[PDB]
Write an enzyme that holds these catalytic residues in place. Structure first.
Site, mmCIF file in Angstrom:
data_model
loop_
_atom_site.group_PDB
_atom_site.id
_atom_site.type_symbol
_atom_site.label_atom_id
_atom_site.label_comp_id
_atom_site.label_asym_id
_atom_site.label_seq_id
_atom_site.Cartn_x
_atom_site.Cartn_y
_atom_site.Cartn_z
ATOM 1 N N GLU B 232 0.772 -1.009 -0.099
ATOM 2 C CA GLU B 232 0.081 0.172 -0.097
ATOM 3 C C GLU B 232 0.753 1.410 0.139
ATOM 4 O OE1 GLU B 232 -3.339 2.367 2.724
ATOM 5 O OE2 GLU B 232 -3.330 0.223 3.020
ATOM 6 N N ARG B 310 -8.230 2.846 13.726
ATOM 7 C CA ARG B 310 -8.922 1.703 13.693
ATOM 8 C C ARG B 310 -8.805 0.650 14.733
ATOM 9 N NH1 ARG B 310 -12.030 -0.906 9.454
ATOM 10 N NH2 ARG B 310 -11.345 0.958 8.212
ATOM 11 N N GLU B 691 -10.868 -8.188 4.531
ATOM 12 C CA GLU B 691 -10.293 -8.155 5.915
ATOM 13 C C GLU B 691 -11.157 -8.720 6.994
ATOM 14 O OE1 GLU B 691 -9.512 -3.906 5.375
ATOM 15 O OE2 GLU B 691 -7.625 -4.217 6.185
HETATM 16 N N1 MTE Z 1 -5.597 -13.181 -2.708
HETATM 17 C C1 MTE Z 1 -5.456 -12.108 -1.949
HETATM 18 N N2 MTE Z 1 -6.525 -11.570 -1.194
HETATM 19 C C2 MTE Z 1 -6.434 -10.617 -0.379
HETATM 20 C C3 MTE Z 1 -5.099 -9.468 -0.574
HETATM 21 C C4 MTE Z 1 -4.049 -9.992 -1.384
HETATM 22 O O1 MTE Z 1 -2.994 -9.398 -1.476
HETATM 23 N N3 MTE Z 1 -4.408 -11.301 -2.116
HETATM 24 N N4 MTE Z 1 -5.140 -8.529 0.047
HETATM 25 C C5 MTE Z 1 -6.026 -8.060 0.880
HETATM 26 C C6 MTE Z 1 -6.305 -6.923 1.824
HETATM 27 S S1 MTE Z 1 -5.141 -6.336 2.900
HETATM 28 C C7 MTE Z 1 -7.320 -6.012 1.174
HETATM 29 S S2 MTE Z 1 -7.580 -4.252 2.054
HETATM 30 C C8 MTE Z 1 -8.456 -6.423 0.407
HETATM 31 C C9 MTE Z 1 -8.399 -5.349 -0.809
HETATM 32 O O2 MTE Z 1 -9.149 -5.689 -1.695
HETATM 33 P P1 MTE Z 1 -10.690 -5.670 -2.021
HETATM 34 O O3 MTE Z 1 -11.004 -4.052 -1.514
HETATM 35 O O4 MTE Z 1 -10.964 -5.813 -3.516
HETATM 36 O O5 MTE Z 1 -11.093 -6.340 -1.121
HETATM 37 O O6 MTE Z 1 -7.857 -7.817 -0.206
HETATM 38 C C10 MTE Z 1 -7.577 -8.718 0.910
HETATM 39 N N5 MTE Z 1 -7.425 -10.235 0.314
HETATM 40 O O1 I3A Z 2 -9.146 2.621 7.415
HETATM 41 C C1 I3A Z 2 -8.418 1.714 6.773
HETATM 42 C C2 I3A Z 2 -7.219 2.360 5.887
HETATM 43 C C3 I3A Z 2 -6.504 1.308 5.063
HETATM 44 N N1 I3A Z 2 -5.489 2.335 4.517
HETATM 45 C C4 I3A Z 2 -5.555 3.478 5.274
HETATM 46 C C5 I3A Z 2 -4.977 4.675 4.661
HETATM 47 C C6 I3A Z 2 -5.246 6.013 5.388
HETATM 48 C C7 I3A Z 2 -6.432 6.027 6.098
HETATM 49 C C8 I3A Z 2 -7.032 5.120 6.547
HETATM 50 C C9 I3A Z 2 -6.742 3.781 5.692
HETATM 51 O O1 MOS Z 3 -6.258 -2.204 3.906
HETATM 52 MO MO1 MOS Z 3 -5.502 -4.023 3.176
HETATM 53 O O2 MOS Z 3 -4.227 -3.282 2.201
HETATM 54 S S1 MOS Z 3 -4.249 -3.978 5.292
#
Ligand code: MTE
Ligand code: I3A
Ligand code: MOS
Ligand code: FAD
Ligand code: MOS
Ligand code: FES
Ligand code: FES
Ligand code: FES
Ligand code: FES
EC number: 1.17.1.4
Lengths: 305, 755, 164, 151, 51, 164
Positions: B232, B310, B691
């Protein structure tokens, strides 16, 4: 096959076709590094920035790959892959009486949750032994069982049972600069002889502080009276060690609660770890050395009954 | 219409065949070079010299890059408190000091190893305790308070206070960080291919370091082999370095991290320490709670503040607490900066909540499920931050999980087992969860799309989100197909790019489906609006006929779409306003058997019921539940990072850091999606899933704790209401040490002992 | 003066006239032959992303043998007269997928996909040795392969269809 | 973008006629910002689909109008932020808009009106307008060789 | 406002410096190949064979 | 058993150990050295898109001489101990433009830009021989350079500033 030579930026590699070639090259260059599976050497080169400008690969040599059944045990050439050892031992356990396969069963227990099929298909038996990691799961079993090692150079040949003296210091074995490990004989168990092996279910450091052990007891014929006792441990020091001071004290004693007490008292002392010992987990490791012996104690009682 | 059908991930077949292209799979240009980072070996020290004389002897060596080579700015990071390359001082092991460039990655590696750095040590701060003792924090205390804590504690029958620690976590995406940078040689132009969840910040950070306008930099993301939050922001550590090499040399340059580099440099989940005090009635009803949270943030701010926000938003889990005070402090330490990791502070706060809730039950001598149920929120209740719980489905998930897992019958079998076994014990626990959906920073809750329909009727969709295995592109194709009323076969998504959709938020917070689905939907609406006259004139014609007629009438077949989540904006200075759009809910029950003599354990059975609204794709959503749960199981039971006293990471690869393996998962592993629970607040009645399920992995931890309690009843003492501290992760070491017996005490040796 | 190194990849002869002993099979596949299906995940044998199948005629057994290996640790200089099979050697979307590849994809056993080639090669190797495996042999086949995305359940479910 | 830099894409291609130059001049005039804040990188089918060939001498006319229309859309979206911060800069207004979740991306489109000549009625406009010119040239010829000089 | 002013072509300086990139100036991939068309030498003919 | 070919490009030493006699300087500059400022426009000497400057020490004249040449027809094998200068050798927008480069750009002498490098090198070569050329010398400098876009007037007008 014929001997091959490959030349790199930093390294010369000789693929030896015969045992005579290997021993000649090792006499000509005692510093030449052996490589079979490269599962340790590859790590040394990449992660510990070791450089070995001359490498000899003996994988093609018939003698280093031979599997031989003898009167006293099963002999494996030092280049035999762990997968091959596992297959051979599983077959032996399946066909032979339980009383003869106590050491084999111990080896198999240590191999059970030990790397993938990928690693076991190329990792050699001799490679694990000579690597001499403090946390090798195999060397404790070979030490406790007195597994015989046949060691050769140009004009020398000797067979020694593995004991405490074979690992003098960190990552070192009692081999000469020119010597190579040819074969390893894993013995049959005798009447009144029992064996167990155990290992810690976690690892937190590269090559220290994972408890792993081999334990053997031989009784006087038809008795519960100790004639021989061996308890060897990895992950409690910078090499595989034997609790000799503790086991020596139990000779002629009977397999009962008093022996359990005395052995546990001996282990707590002999294998004691300083608060700042490398790898930490001080309390846990002490508890495991005793808990593993307890399991052995109970198992031997069940085998005796 | 495939919405609600279990369509396989669109790239699955290519992934299985090794045809799907990841960043390092892209062909190399004839002249492309390779970069290897050079990194600090000290936690905190002055840099006295950097010697590259030995590195220059390595065949294929091109140059060494350091701070002095940067044309624009050496100031970087989300809060501008980082260096691209450290100049005078290093502030963690792994702190990037420079980089070697060479003609092969092997040569780069060789050269980097023989770069010699000379240091002068400075006093370092590594642990949370170190940081508290030294008043070493980023910013001021964060707080949420509701009710009257004094009074609450007065009315309590019982009070329990304690301390708890939860270790961090390495992302262990199977694909490590990777960037290719291609300098064009015109006007500062550069095109980068990056494994990142954040093309926008990648673009901005590169532009800032080079000192060129943002419009010169194009960032492209086809896919990632996993991100989990670790891509990220921290991906810029590699991207910016490689961009500099590209700029300096005029050649294309790439870098992919080895595992050991990645684990050392890029940051992980935040370790948390909590000090807590709970007041409760003899019935188990909670009347007061105070929790002080401390996170180990490492050597820059990054996302640490939002992570703590969070955490504070989730200190309630699913429980109504009338008098409550939660605070948080970010510890500033000489460790690699910690970052986003799936759950984003949520799992830590939820773990802390379930820990004191477990102790309430024990203290009251009541069954844990009874105490949890008693304290649960009801439909329409306000959280501690005063948001209304609308559509609160935990009670439904709870009831269905209890029934389908056969909880009460299995509890008796667990008791029977423990009655009959001395040196092995079973445990069983059922745990709920709620997870707030939205970025806690209001402005990030925005999403763009761009759609083109070509004259053959085929459609190309572009949106701000990135694919990291979660099946976002799959879901967006399903949405577009439903919206436009054409087969999925007519729609394609190629990649994510800063020149198609600008200013995108990171692909994070579990909301990508929600927000990009809306953006895609709106763009689709615009297309349908434009085609409507042609459909009217030719109602029995095909899509293709309508598209061609529109083209020949000079109607545009290209549009943007945009979405911004409405009614968001929580104020810490009023304790009001919506922090989240809605909540995702779920319940898990797990059973374990521990070996009391070794600390090893078996995961016997897990049952999960998850509220994901009306799933766009139940195969993908069930996959997200399972994957998230197993990552949580790793966090709470297997995965342990270990540092030297000097602050140097020991656990730098799979031999010393144990993620869940094939053989780690529950023997019986059941997941159900709750039925007939449409979510009015999101696209096609769906809910975010990425998540929310991770914390359910803690069901395994609390089953283990249950099993330990049985072992202590067997061998330790006679106090059934005893509270013992069990930190996370519950590794074999912690489990074994907790089963106090004749071995741990040395009573077996003849010594007196505490058993 | 160096000998030529001769091995096979996906049925095709490779003659390497200037083999460097330091070169790994993974490096050779990806960076000399341009076969990028086989992945780097750790470089230390723990993750299986680099899993390939090796075959040779074992002169000491008088038998063709097939086994799996980590390409990240295999020196090319060990491979003289060995045949390498990678994920692209067993099937493709441009020709026809192998049943192993079809089943892991359709069973939702692939999310990010980065571990999928290594797992496919582990399953393929098993079937090459034992075309009628037991359920039990199927789980043991993957001790060397890690997946961060799936939680493993779907992979085992799809593969269990090859059992008995 | 959030630094205030602008990326313009349009269906026309550059072949030396200075089309991108003219489009940047138009965008700069329309947005009321210096040409140095605006960039055109390339022409691509994934940014502007279904483009006519760059031909018929009308690219400035038609892409100029499309760019102008997209610029007006941007100005309309930025206007409230200008009013909140009237002493501020372009960059300040753009960042304010971003942080208020206003989209800073738009399409523009132009269709030339009232064209459609028919060969079967000899009516309807064939062209939008006509371009005109006059040239006067003088030469000297060599009657013995056929060579000549353009004087 | 530069509309109506003689602003030089935006790429002219890079054109004069040889920095402006045209199609064939794009670097080649390591594995990139080259094509050459095979063309008729007859105005109108049946193709009998290609060797 | 071939000799080494040694020449210089923009002041940097080129040591070609395996020169092919069929290799043109244009192919070498573009496809070996990656200096793509010099263009292919015809391959037959008529267009000057590939114009570079060559410098050598003359023995008979006892001086360094400078002249222009078509890189599309210059065999690299004629260039032993010769110094080559290309458009990138005289200036750039990343450092400073040469006056010739600045003036053609600012005078509207470059439209599509494809002929611009060759014309720059023709004018540059003239100035290296004669820093104060006449108007007549300026036009003659370009009999070998074609431009399809400009109609030539602005190029001559811009470069007239170097005259008198
Ligand atoms: N296969 C897979 N699933 C995953 C991830 C990933 O890197 N690979 N990342 C996770 C995280 S940290 C998040 S925030 C969500 C983000 O994607 P979405 O917003 O499309 O769910 O996928 C989740 N599931
Ligand atoms: O609240 C979830 C979150 C994930 N990435 C960021 C980045 C900045 C603010 C909030 C968040
Ligand atoms: O909010 Mo998922 O990129 S830890
Ligand atoms: C992922 C993975 C997991 C592992 N897990 C475990 C585990 O759980 N428990 C455990 O005990 N081990 C484990 N190992 C270690 C493994 O068993 C050894 O690395 C392997 O057996 C070494 O054999 P090799 O043929 O690859 O040795 P090489 O790397 O080729 O050589 C190793 C050493 O032995 C020397 N050598 C080899 N043959 C001879 C010879 N015959 N005579 C004299 N010297 C010789 C070499 O010079 C070198 O010093 C693991 C390894 C990997 C990569
Ligand atoms: O209309 Mo110009 O492309 S002939
Ligand atoms: S790359 Fe992980 S085992 Fe080879
Ligand atoms: S599918 Fe992502 S690592 Fe397995
Ligand atoms: S390319 Fe035309 S003269 Fe050389
Ligand atoms: S500017 Fe185009 S050929 Fe001269």
């Amino acid at each position: 096959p014929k001997q091959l030579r490959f030349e790199g930026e930093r390294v010369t590699w000789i693929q030896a076709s015969t045992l005579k070639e290997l021993l000649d090259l090792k006499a000509q260059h005692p510093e030449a590094k052996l490589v079979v599976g490269n599962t340790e050497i590859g790590i040394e080169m990449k992660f510990k920035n070791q450089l070995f400008p001359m490498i000899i690969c003996p994988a093609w040599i018939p003698e280093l790959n031979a599997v031989e059944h003898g009167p006293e045990g099963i002999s494996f050439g030092a280049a035999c892959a762990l997968s091959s050892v596992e297959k051979t031992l599983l077959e032996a356990v399946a066909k032979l009486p339980t009383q003869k396969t106590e050491v084999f069963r111990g080896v198999l227990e240590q191999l059970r949750w030990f790397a993938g099929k990928q690693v076991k298909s190329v990792a050699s038996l001799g490679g694990n032994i000579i690597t001499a990691s403090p946390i090798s799961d195999l060397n404790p079993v070979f030490m406790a069982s007195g597994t015989k090692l046949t060691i050769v150079s140009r004009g020398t040949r000797r067979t020694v049972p593995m004991d405490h003296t074979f690992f003098p210091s960190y990552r070192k074995t009692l081999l000469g600069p020119e010597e190579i490990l040819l074969s390893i004989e894993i013995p049959y168990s005798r009447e009144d002889e029992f064996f167990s092996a155990f290992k810690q279910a976690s690892r937190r450091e590269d090559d220290i502080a994972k408890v792993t052990c081999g334990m053997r007891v031989l009784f006087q014929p038809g008795s519960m009276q100790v004639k021989e006792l061996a308890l060897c441990y990895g992950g409690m020091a910078d090499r595989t060690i034997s609790a000799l001071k503790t086991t020596q004290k139990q000779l002629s004693k009977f397999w009962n609660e008093k022996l359990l007490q005395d052995v546990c008292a001996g282990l707590a002392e002999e294998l004691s770890l300083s608060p700042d010992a490398p790898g930490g987990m001080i309390e846990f490791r002490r508890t495991l050395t005793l808990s593993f012996f307890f399991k052995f104690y109970l198992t031997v009682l069940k085998k005796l009954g | 219409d495939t919405v609600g059908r279990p369509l396989p991930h669109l790239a699955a077949a290519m992934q299985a065949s090794g045809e799907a292209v990841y960043c390092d799979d892209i062909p190399r240009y004839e002249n492309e070079l390779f970069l290897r980072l050079v990194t600090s070996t000290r936690a905190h020290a002055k840099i006295k010299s950097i010697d590259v004389s030995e590195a220059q002897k390595v065949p294929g060596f091109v140059c060494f890059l350091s701070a002095d080579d940067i044309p624009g700015s050496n100031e970087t990071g989300l809060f501008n408190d980082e260096t691209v390359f450290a100049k005078d001082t290093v502030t963690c092991v792994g702190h990037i000091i420079g980089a070697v460039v060479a003609d092969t990655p092997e040569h780069a590696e060789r050269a980097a190893h023989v770069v010699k750095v000379t240091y002068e040590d400075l006093p370092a701060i590594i642990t949370i305790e170190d940081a508290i003792k030294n008043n070493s924090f980023y910013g001021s205390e964060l707080k949420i308070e509701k009710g009257d804590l004094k009074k609450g504690f007065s009315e309590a029958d019982n009070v329990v206070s304690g301390e708890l620690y939860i270790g961090g976590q390495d992302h262990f995406y199977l694909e490590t960080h990777c960037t290719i940078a291609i300098p064009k040689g015109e006007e500062g132009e550069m095109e980068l291919f990056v494994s990142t969840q954040n093309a926008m910040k990648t673009q901005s950070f590169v532009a800032k370091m080079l000192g060129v306008p943002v419009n010169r930099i194009l960032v492209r993301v086809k896919r990632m082999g996993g991100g989990f939050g670790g891509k990220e922001t921290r991906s810029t550590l590699v991207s910016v370095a490689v961009a500099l090499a590209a700029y300096k040399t005029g050649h294309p340059v790439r870098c992919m991290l080895d595992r050991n580099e990645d684990m050392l440099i890029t940051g992980g989940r935040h370790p948390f320490l909590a000090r807590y005090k709970v007041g409760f009635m003899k019935t188990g009803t909670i009347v007061a709670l105070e929790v002080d949270h401390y996170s180990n943030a490492g050597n820059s701010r990054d996302l640490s503040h939002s992570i703590m926000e969070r955490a504070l938003f989730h200190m309630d889990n699913c429980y109504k607490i009338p008098n409550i005070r939660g605070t948080g402090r970010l510890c500033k330490t000489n460790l690699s900066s910690n970052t986003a990791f799936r759950g984003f502070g949520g799992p830590q706060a939820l773990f802390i909540a379930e820990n004191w809730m477990s102790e309430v039950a024990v203290t009251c001598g009541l069954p844990a499920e009874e105490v949890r149920w008693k304290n649960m929120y009801k439909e329409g209740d306000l959280t501690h931050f005063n948001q209304r719980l609308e559509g609160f489905s935990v009670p439904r998930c709870w009831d269905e999980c209890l029934k389908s897992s056969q909880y009460y019958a299995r509890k008796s079998e667990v008791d029977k087992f423990n009655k009959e076994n001395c040196w092995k014990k079973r445990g069983l626990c059922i745990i709920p969860t709620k997870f707030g959906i939205s970025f806690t920073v209001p402005f990030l809750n925005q999403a763009g799309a761009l759609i083109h329909v070509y004259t053959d009727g085929s459609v190309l969709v572009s949106h701000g989100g990135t694919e990291m295995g979660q099946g976002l592109h799959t879901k967006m194709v399903q949405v577009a197909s439903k919206a436009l009323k054409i087969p999925i076969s007519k729609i394609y998504i190629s990649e994510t790019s800063t020149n198609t959709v600008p200013n995108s938020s990171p692909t994070a917070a579990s909301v990508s489906t929600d927000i990009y689905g809306q953006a895609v939907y709106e763009a689709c609406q615009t297309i349908l609006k434009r085609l409507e006259p042609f459909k009217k004139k030719n109602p029995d014609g095909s899509w293709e006929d309508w598209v061609m007629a529109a083209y020949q009438d000079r109607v545009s077949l290209s549009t943007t779409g945009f979405y911004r989540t409405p009614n968001l904006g929580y104020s810490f200075e009023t304790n009001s306003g919506n922090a989240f759009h809605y909540f995702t809910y779920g319940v898990a029950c797990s059973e374990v058997e521990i070996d009391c003599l070794t600390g090893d354990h078996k995961n016997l059975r897990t049952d999960i019921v998850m509220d994901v609204g009306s799933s766009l794709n139940p195969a993908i959503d069930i996959g997200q539940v399972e994957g998230a749960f197993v990552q949580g199981l790793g966090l709470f039971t297997l995965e342990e990072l270990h540092y030297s006293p000097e602050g140097s990471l020991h656990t730098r690869g799979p031999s010393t850091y144990k993620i869940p393996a094939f053989g780690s998962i529950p023997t019986e592993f059941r997941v159900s999606l709750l039925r007939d629970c449409p979510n009015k607040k999101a696209i096609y009645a769906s809910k975010a899933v990425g998540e929310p399920p991770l914390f359910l992995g803690a069901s395994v931890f609390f089953a283990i704790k249950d099993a330990i309690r049985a072992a202590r009843a067997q061998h330790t003492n006679n106090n059934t209401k005893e509270l013992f501290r069990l930190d996370s992760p519950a590794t074999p070491e912690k489990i074994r040490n907790a089963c106090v017996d004749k071995f741990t005490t040395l009573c077996v040796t003849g010594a007196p002992g505490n058993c | 003066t160096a000998d030529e190194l001769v091995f096979f990849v996906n049925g095709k002869k490779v003659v390497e006239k200037n083999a460097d002993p330091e070169t790994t099979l993974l490096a050779y596949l990806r960076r000399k032959l341009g076969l990028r299906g086989t992945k780097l995940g750790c470089g230390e044998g723990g993750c299986g992303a680099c899993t390939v199948m090796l075959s040779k005629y074992d002169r000491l057994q008088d038998k063709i043998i097939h086994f799996s290996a980590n390409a990240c640790l295999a020196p090319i200089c060990t491979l003289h007269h060995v045949a390498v099979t990678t994920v692209e050697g067993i099937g493709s979307t441009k020709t026809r997928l192998h049943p192993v590849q079809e089943r892991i994809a359709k069973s939702h056993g692939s999310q990010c996909g980065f571990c999928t080639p290594g797992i496919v090669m582990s399953m393929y190797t098993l079937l090459r040795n034992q075309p009628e495996p037991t359920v039990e042999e199927i789980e043991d086949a993957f001790q060397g392969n890690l997946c961060r995305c799936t939680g493993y359940r779907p992979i085992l479910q799809g593969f269990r269809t090859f059992a008995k």
